[PDB]
């Protein structure tokens, strides 16, 4: 068990702190000409969607308490790296300039089974012609994560889609309703290409809202799993969805356990996991942790005749797909495919 993640962002100066696993030492990231990318990369590693802003700090005046020495970034390996721990070497930072960055505030309840308002501020309702069809989880104000299966050819007219947020009850007039610009679905979700296909695999879609949702105590984004963060067998997470929003505390079940118990002898496919039987389609599967020195809820699964373990899209396996689809398809209108 790793109770503390090897990448940290400071609560006082917002400085980035990276752990040297072999030396057991915390180090500061050395400042370079590609500070924007590293700030962004460091926030992504910790499960944040992006860096809001980054800053340049100096040891001479900024202190260096809690760290010893520095890590330098490989600026040549950085453009196509999926990890920060692979592109960093132990170095001496002569100028003593280190990286500080403010990440997007993510996965927290802003407190000042029927549910009460504010417990899951990321939970959204996706409505087609007024009717609730699929669930979603806000990753930001104008980005929702859900299932690909939510958009069959039948429900592809985007101007007929709406995203309901900041309300537990579907009839609540307090909750906000916004339209949809693009729907980025995984090109690897085969039941779309084949209507006789067995698969639940690559059942992930990114809903981009035409305008950002105001972030309130009722509306907030959820965290993505951290880079390398494990899905613990026996860890009890929460699944939410629907006309008042309900929650269920469900345990994570081993691949082996579900595969050894399945009645039809069906094996859980790659990029997917199972969880105990207590389930709204595309709805969230969130777990809480303190690996970032603060309790944060993270989106671990997507809901993809039986009282059997539910099968979910394992979100940690689509981290890059999510970070790429947003970088690439921000300016897109309509249905979009992302391989």
């Amino acid at each position: 068990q790793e109770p503390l993640y090897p990448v940290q962002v400071s609560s006082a100066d917002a400085r980035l702190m990276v752990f040297d696993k072999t030396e057991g030492t915390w180090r500061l990231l050395c400042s370079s000409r590609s500070n924007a990318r590293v700030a962004g990369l460091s926030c992504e590693e910790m499960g944040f969607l992006r860096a809001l802003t980054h800053s340049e700090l100096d040891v001479r005046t900024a202190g260096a308490n809690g760290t010893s020495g520095f890590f330098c970034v490989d600026e040549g390996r950085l453009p196509h790296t999926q990890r920060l721990l692979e592109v960093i070497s132990v170095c001496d930072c002569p100028r003593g300039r280190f990286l500080a960055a403010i990440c997007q505030d993510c996965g927290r309840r802003k407190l000042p089974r029927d549910t009460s308002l504010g417990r899951w501020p990321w939970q959204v309702s996706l409505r087609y012609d007024g009717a609730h069809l699929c669930g979603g989880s806000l990753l930001s104000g104008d980005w929702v994560l859900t299932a690909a299966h939510c958009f069959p050819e039948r429900n592809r007219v985007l101007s007929r889609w709406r995203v309901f947020a900041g309300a537990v009850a579907q009839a609540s007039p307090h909750g906000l309703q916004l339209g949809v610009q693009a729907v980025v679905y995984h090109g690897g979700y085969l039941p779309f290409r084949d209507p006789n296909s067995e698969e639940n695999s690559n059942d992930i879609a990114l809903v981009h809202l035409s305008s950002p949702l105001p972030l309130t105590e009722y509306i907030q984004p959820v965290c993505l799993p951290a880079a390398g963060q494990a899905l613990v067998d026996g860890k009890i997470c929460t699944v939410t969805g629907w006309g008042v929003l309900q929650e269920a505390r469900v345990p994570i079940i081993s691949n082996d356990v579900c595969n050894g118990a399945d009645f039809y002898g069906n094996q859980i496919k790659p990029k997917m996991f199972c969880a105990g039987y207590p389930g709204d389609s595309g709805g969230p599967f969130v777990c809480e942790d303190s690996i970032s020195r603060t309790p944060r809820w993270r989106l671990c699964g997507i809901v993809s005749l039986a009282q059997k373990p539910g099968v979910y899209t394992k979100v940690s396996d689509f981290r890059e797909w999510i970070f790429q689809a947003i970088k690439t398809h921000s300016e897109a209108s309509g249905m979009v495919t992302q391989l």
């Epitope: 595969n259 009645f263 039809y264 002898g265 069906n266 094996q267």
Partner: antibody, heavy 113, light 110 residues
């Protein structure tokens, strides 16, 4: 047409070995696992474990560790079971199953001196 | 030492309804035991009827219901046919393995 067909009855002496077969058809063999169940004469049923077919990795029930070995041959889509150093108590009808939904007819293994 | 207990033999008349219980010796049968029911008709191969407490197999009809009845796993056979006569085995999952109940012979009374 999901079908499971097992090899014929075996008559072995104590100390010998036996490779019992289970041919699968009517589905993509790699998408679904295979499990082994034993029934000794007039006795109950025993889940012996299962074999992962996309990795080929076997899981064995406590009682079956050591002598028994689940193995595969994908090209011909068949699941195997080999019991080395056969003992008097290995006398049983051994079945293959893809979940509990689909079973083989069973293979009788008589171990006698 | 875990034993799964089934009624040795049960009678039912054509058209009648019968319920078969499955007991766990460690206590209450729960959804975590993902109770399966297997049928063996005379001379025929085994055929899974029910899995994960109440999931019906493609060949098992609607008159066949699997549930949890008073800390046990139960299998109901409604509007019984003389063809329903077989041996019924329940399998309970215990963390990492299955345990089969000794079995029940349901005789359709002819």
């Amino acid at each position: 047409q999901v079908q499971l067909v097992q090899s014929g009855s075996e008559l072995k002496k104590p100390g010998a070995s036996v490779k019992v077969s289970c041919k699968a058809s009517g589905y993509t063999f790699t998408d679904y696992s295979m499990r082994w169940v034993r029934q000794a004469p007039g006795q109950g049923l025993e889940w012996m474990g299962w074999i992962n077919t996309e990795t080929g990795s076997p899981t064995y029930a406590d009682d079956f560790k050591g002598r028994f070995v689940f193995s595969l041959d994908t090209s011909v889509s068949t699941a195997y079971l080999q019991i080395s150093s056969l003992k008097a108590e290995d006398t049983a009808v051994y079945y293959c199953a893809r979940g509990f939904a689909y079973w083989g007819q069973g293979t009788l293994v008589t171990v006698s001196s | 030492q875990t034993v799964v207990t089934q009624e040795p033999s049960l009678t039912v008349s054509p058209g009648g309804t019968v319920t078969l219980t499955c007991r766990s010796s460690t206590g209450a049968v729960t959804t975590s035991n993902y109770a399966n029911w297997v049928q063996q008709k005379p001379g025929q191969a085994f055929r899974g009827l029910i899995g994960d407490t109440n999931n019906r197999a493609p060949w098992t009809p609607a008159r066949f219901s699997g549930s949890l009845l008073g800390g046990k796993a139960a299998l109901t056979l409604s509007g019984v046919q003389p063809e329903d006569e077989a041996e019924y085995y329940c399998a309970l999952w215990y963390s990492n393995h299955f345990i089969f109940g000794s079995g029940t012979k349901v005789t359709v009374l002819g």
